[PDB]
Scaffold this active site. Structure first.
Site, PDB file in Angstrom:
ATOM      1  N   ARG A   8       0.874  -1.161   0.000  1.00 25.93           N
ATOM      2  CA  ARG A   8       0.000   0.000   0.000  1.00 25.93           C
ATOM      3  C   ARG A   8       0.917   1.218   0.000  1.00 25.93           C
ATOM      4  NH1 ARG A   8      -1.975  -3.540   3.678  1.00 25.93           N
ATOM      5  NH2 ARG A   8      -3.596  -4.798   2.637  1.00 25.93           N
ATOM      6  N   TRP A  37      -2.403 -10.860   2.040  1.00 31.62           N
ATOM      7  CA  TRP A  37      -3.761 -11.127   2.506  1.00 31.62           C
ATOM      8  C   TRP A  37      -3.887 -12.426   3.290  1.00 31.62           C
ATOM      9  CZ3 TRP A  37      -3.268  -9.603  -2.832  1.00 31.62           C
ATOM     10  CH2 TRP A  37      -3.964  -8.434  -3.191  1.00 31.62           C
ATOM     11  N   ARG A  46      -1.851  -2.716  -7.062  1.00 31.38           N
ATOM     12  CA  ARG A  46      -2.204  -3.840  -6.181  1.00 31.38           C
ATOM     13  C   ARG A  46      -3.308  -4.609  -6.880  1.00 31.38           C
ATOM     14  NH1 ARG A  46      -1.390  -4.796  -0.800  1.00 31.38           N
ATOM     15  NH2 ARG A  46      -3.385  -5.558   0.036  1.00 31.38           N
ATOM     16  N   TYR A  72     -10.994  -8.540  -7.239  1.00 33.67           N
ATOM     17  CA  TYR A  72     -10.126  -7.948  -8.262  1.00 33.67           C
ATOM     18  C   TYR A  72      -9.899  -8.553  -9.675  1.00 33.67           C
ATOM     19  CZ  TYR A  72      -8.503  -4.674  -4.505  1.00 33.67           C
ATOM     20  OH  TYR A  72      -8.407  -3.725  -3.518  1.00 33.67           O
ATOM     21  N   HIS A  82      -4.001   2.553  -5.085  1.00 32.39           N
ATOM     22  CA  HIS A  82      -4.195   1.109  -5.092  1.00 32.39           C
ATOM     23  C   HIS A  82      -4.199   0.422  -6.454  1.00 32.39           C
ATOM     24  CE1 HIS A  82      -4.274   0.159  -1.000  1.00 32.39           C
ATOM     25  NE2 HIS A  82      -5.397  -0.514  -0.926  1.00 32.39           N
TER      26      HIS A  82
END
Lengths: 319, 324, 319, 324
Positions: free
Chosen positions: A155, A297, A274, A306, A271
């Site tokens: 991040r 994660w 990512r 995603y 973001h």
DNA sequence: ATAAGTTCGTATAATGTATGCTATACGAAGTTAT
DNA sequence: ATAACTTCGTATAGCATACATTATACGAACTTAT
DNA sequence: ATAAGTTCGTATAATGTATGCTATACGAAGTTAT
DNA sequence: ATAACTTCGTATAGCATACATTATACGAACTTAT
């Protein structure tokens, strides 16, 4: 009771650090909002009355705010109370059910929480293909950043926290980035984000033209003034707001200025890489279990979110 | 829990009734009616519910031969009626907890079978396609497009009914795409695109020449066809899910006949058959658990798994080792 | 209180079925034991006094019983009390700590809970190689059983519960065994244990010579009397005790009569093929995640326990 | 919680003190002494502990620059002292919970580094083996067998000390097996067998000719060697784990010298070095996570993982994709 | 007589952790227009 | 005197036993159709 | 003047769920026998 | 009358939104070394 509330609240303010600076910014932003709605209607803002909280959520809903923002207001209020040793608004049917209802009515009218414009290997390759040839300090920095963002999937705030002393080497010559705290973890063990030979190069070029490696305790990324002179620091980070600007500027470079719609995610943002990387990994055939360690994660949903359709049956049929 | 608190809780429920789906309310009302009538009949008070009384009712439900999952729904709705009214839930009583456990135990041991839809696989579509693609009948043409969009797509019944004509494209080749919305989760999706073959897209052409369904675009793709074989579009009414279940049942009767084996469920084809068969076919030709625990939006397994279990490709590692 | 205890206990006896028949057999066996120890020392067995429970565990320990058996006595007592609405013996330091101590002192003297002698593909192949040629009803049954035990990894009690109506076919012709309840699950969904073509044959031969398929509702396995005549039933199962005897007899057939040690697991037993299969799968290179569905385990430890050293470093070194 | 209850609870603790390892008791006593002295010093009562007082102590510990995991041990032992005495735990107080959180947060952000042993890899064993296999010195011979049985085996220090001579076999070729017991879990193992190379088994031969350690079998394989270079077997005393840590430290000094970089930890080799290096070597030559998260009995990962992290084989899927 | 169990008691090993809101099922009763 | 320890104490890294039940292990006593 | 931020406010997306018993670390102080 | 539904009600299969916080999105107001 009164004394107990003053102490619970007080006990919270003493060890402020126990929670994120951002939780505080929102606690306060919500309270500012609620207190405002309360004054205009002559109601006591604390302790909050369920029925009052309910008209408040309905009022946010009518202001056209997102279900998530409405759930943020309720959650902050709930925290103020629970941590206050007082009941939570959500502890009342009136508040419980209106939340469900607002969510239910909002989605059934469309509303879907959004995800950032993806930044995948292709955009990285194109951007790098163009920026590679710049000798400008800004450009070298910005390409190293994007490279780290895509490669590590960190991040932006974790990237801004990288300090020179955090970088090491694999043996193959690959750079290793040590990560302390994330949104999902605050441990002494922590992660070791590795970079590809090409991304290391990129980074290597930035450390060099910048002289950040001057002090190990220096932040990997810092401002770079109009004159092209970097400005290393071991006390100030390059704001995540600026990092967000790199993404926007890089996107403006390739695709030009953005819409007038006023919508979010018209350009790349913090973001973007990512989402973009997570994805690229799916396609490559990377294992979810693997796509997962990449992003750090400890679960499968976001990850799931995603990559999708949002085909196969057309070949069985098609033959 | 004080009748004034309760009365406030019940008004809270009615005021924000839109907090639940109307299907949910329907089930709640249904359980209450059943619970109320049994309490009358048996001379018990129905509100608030006493644990011993609820236990006697759950046994009454089992003696009635209802499914363990049905007894669950009852206790479940009761538990909510009380939870959302301020009274203690029945599930919070030893006697109610114990009986549900036993009942569950007793049922699983009488052979309690969780059923799933009768597959409607390609072998089924072709054969149906065979007995129909040559039918001039307006209803025969419409029912083909349907089994097409159900199988080719794995879309749910409540989902195909929703579909409008202003939801179709022409993508990649006279094919056709169907922007959907098979999600209702805020942090899911906005919609998706389902594509079709020379199988589907085409049938879905003849349905439009004969349905004259596209004359106005607000309309919905699938409409009712009367006894005269005349169509009746609508941007305001969609075919009932019952009607779509009908096309499946009707279609199976054409090939196999009169309702069969008892009064049981899934004796023919039902709304979910197409999704069940699409899967196995997709699993049989070995097609990754992506468009398998995914193609019909199952971002959530056992589903694609309960469907492809008897398959040979899903036989397990022991069979594989024993057979070399 | 007294009335409340009589009702809690009474409420438990009413819905006896809520728990396994075996939990009851042990509740009672433990109580028989404790009550006995109590009488001999003039102590009240219920409610149990922590200090009394403690001397009881120490007394079991001194009788040379296993830590697991001692933990069974404490667990049954704990259940009697907790379900009684009374405190649990384990709720007292005296009982809590003595348990730890007994365990700690027992292991540190060796004690390790045991696992059954494995029955793997080799033993199956050898046994089948010899029994295959028998035309005896007993033998045909026993080979079908062992085959199902190895192939499906089901516990003996699950195997005894199989009813003819539970068997189906895959299409490839492979038999499919539907499993209702297990030690780990009691659901209406349930499992579909598949058999290899060779094991199906085996089963097929048994159904045939036995005529169990007569009634679908008949148990797959039943007694077979000295005269070779099977004795199908849809009300009585072949006891798990007999199933255990098949394993023992098959082992006696190949390796002869067992030791005089009086130790357990001198021959194969009910769990021999589960251990054995789990294992064989590890070696084959089967994925733990896969070895796991085979045994129906929703976790990784037992699984872990069954395969190990109890090598690699000798090749790096060896070269 | 009544002093009579407490006094009963404390006698319970002492009566069944064998419920814990003596190492555990040592740590408990240590924390109490520290907590007691600070309470005296600061004029607070140490039993029972008041939340505000424990919070002030945890901050005192942080200001002392102790590791977040060390502050944890303190709160931890205190929490147990009170939990096992009948008093409320300090961790059960908002102020104590909040401060631990902050403190943890503040530390991770000052660069708090969880350390692990300095690897002692093959490159290390060979080089050491090089500077020593030609040493007549009784202590040089003994220290070789050790690094042999530590690396070749990944056995823990408290574990090699325990080893007897009546624990060795000759298996598969003049090799040698070491029936161990690296478990203390009832539902684990009874013991295992660790094997050796021409590297290990051999060195482990010269140690026996010179140690004369095998004269009686109750004895332990590794013993102390005095200044005269004379050995002294024992079926009753084992080399201290400190002594084994010594052989590692000594050995690293021989090659690199005088204690280095600060007063920090792991500046040289420690008891765990061999297990750390064995792993990476085993991970470098790509050797399945079996004898990796297993060979040194780690039926429990992050361990083999925290050890092989900087390795190139463990670089991750992104590097792999970026590099094609 | 007896093989082949069953039943039963004490002893000891093995294992998961859970719901509650919303859709489909299907017989049927009700409604329209042929 | 010191080498070579051992024992200590405080510091920190690396693990693994408690719930609540449900099941199997096995000898021996009893049961039934042959 | 100004590029390149920083700071800050409202708005909205993203994510884990945890310890507590026992071992090693290492400087040092204590103990033996050379 | 019925085909072709729709609406119902009870039965059951298939899912997916609430906690508690921590983070990012982005315009705009302000800051500083050039």
């Amino acid at each position: 009771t009164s004394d107990e509330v003053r102490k619970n609240l007080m006990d919270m303010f003493r060890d402020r650090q126990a929670f994120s600076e951002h939780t505080w910014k929102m606690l306060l932003s919500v309270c500012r909002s609620w207190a405002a709605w309360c004054k205009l209607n002559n109601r006591k803002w604390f302790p909050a009355e369920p029925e009052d909280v309910r008209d408040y959520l309905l009022y946010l809903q009518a202001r056209g705010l997102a279900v998530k923002t409405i759930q943020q207001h309720l959650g902050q209020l709930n925290m103020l109370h629970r941590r206050s040793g007082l009941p939570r608004p959500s502890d009342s049917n009136a508040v419980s059910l209106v939340m469900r209802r607002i969510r239910k009515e909002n989605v059934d009218a469309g509303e879907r929480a959004k995800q950032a414009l993806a930044f995948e290997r292709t955009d990285f390759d194109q951007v790098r293909s163009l920026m590679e040839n710049s000798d400008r300090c800004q450009d070298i920095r910005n390409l190293a950043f994007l490279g780290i963002a895509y490669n590590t999937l960190l991040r932006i705030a974790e990237i801004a926290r990288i300090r020179v002393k955090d970088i090491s080497r694999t043996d193959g010559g690959r750079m290793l980035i040590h990560i302390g705290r994330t949104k999902t973890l605050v441990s002494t063990a922590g992660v070791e984000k590795a970079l590809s030979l090409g991304v290391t190069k990129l980074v290597e070029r930035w450390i060099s033209v910048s002289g950040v490696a001057d002090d190990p305790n220096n932040y990997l990324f810092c401002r770079v003034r109009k004159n092209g002179v970097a400005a290393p620091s071991a006390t100030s980070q390059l704001s995540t707001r600026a990092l967000e600007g790199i993404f926007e500027a890089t996107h403006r470079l390739i695709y030009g200025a953005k819409d007038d719609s006023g919508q979010r995610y018209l350009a790349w943002s913090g973001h973007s890489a990512r989402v973009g990387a997570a994805r690229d990994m799916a396609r490559a055939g990377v294992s979810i279990p693997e796509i997962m360690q990449a992003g750090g994660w400890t679960n499968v949903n976001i990850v799931m979110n995603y990559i999708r359709n949002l085909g196969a049956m057309v070949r069985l049929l098609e033959d």
